[PDB]
Structure formats: C-alpha cells, structure tokens
C-alpha cells in the first residue's frame, strides 16, 4: 500500500489534527524526535499500540512496510 492511502483510510483519524496528543501528520518538528527512534521501533509500536493510540491504528490490512509508507507520509 501506499503511505498516502494508509494515511487516508485509518491515521489521519487521529494525527490530522494531533488529537490527545498524536504527533500532527505533515509536522517535521513534532515527528522528529519520534524518527529519530527508528522506524524498526516505531513499526512495533503501532502494532502493539501506544497509550490512547490503540494497537495497529486502524488499519486492519497493514504491512510492516505499510507501516512504515504510512510514517514517512505523516513524517513531512
Ligand atoms: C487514534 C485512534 C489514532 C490512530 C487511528 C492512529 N494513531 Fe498513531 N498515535 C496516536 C496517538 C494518540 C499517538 C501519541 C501516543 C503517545 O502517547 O505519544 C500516536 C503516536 C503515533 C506514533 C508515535 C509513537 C511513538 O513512539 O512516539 C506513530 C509512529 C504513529 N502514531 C503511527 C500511526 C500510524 C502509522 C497510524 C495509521 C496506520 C496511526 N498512528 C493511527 C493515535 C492514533
């Protein structure tokens, strides 16, 4: 899948607008720190999910590579 139509089915839901504290989708300041844990890491973490972000992110077909397309593409 492409980064953009994993964004637009299930995380944009959440990190458009950055609610109850999700890094905002196209803000480099706010996603940097989180990249810079590695995206192995982040991959993980959106699996098992993370605090009010529930596991997989809504998205019920997801690869790791899926993933990882779908961070990049909220990463800028
Ligand atoms: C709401 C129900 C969410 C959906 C749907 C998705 N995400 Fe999420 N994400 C959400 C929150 C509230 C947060 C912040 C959690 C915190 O306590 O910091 C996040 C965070 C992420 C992160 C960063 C994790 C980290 O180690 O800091 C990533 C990498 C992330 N989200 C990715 C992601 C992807 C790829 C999604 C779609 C498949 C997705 N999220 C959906 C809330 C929600």
Redesign the pocket.
Known sequence: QEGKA??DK??H???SMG?????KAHDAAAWEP?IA?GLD??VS??KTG?????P????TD?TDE??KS??EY?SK
């Open positions: 994993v964004y299930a995380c839901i959440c990190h609610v109850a504290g999700a890094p989180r844990q890491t982040l973490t959106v993370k605090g009010a972000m529930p997989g992110g809504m998205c997801c899926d993933y779908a961070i909220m």
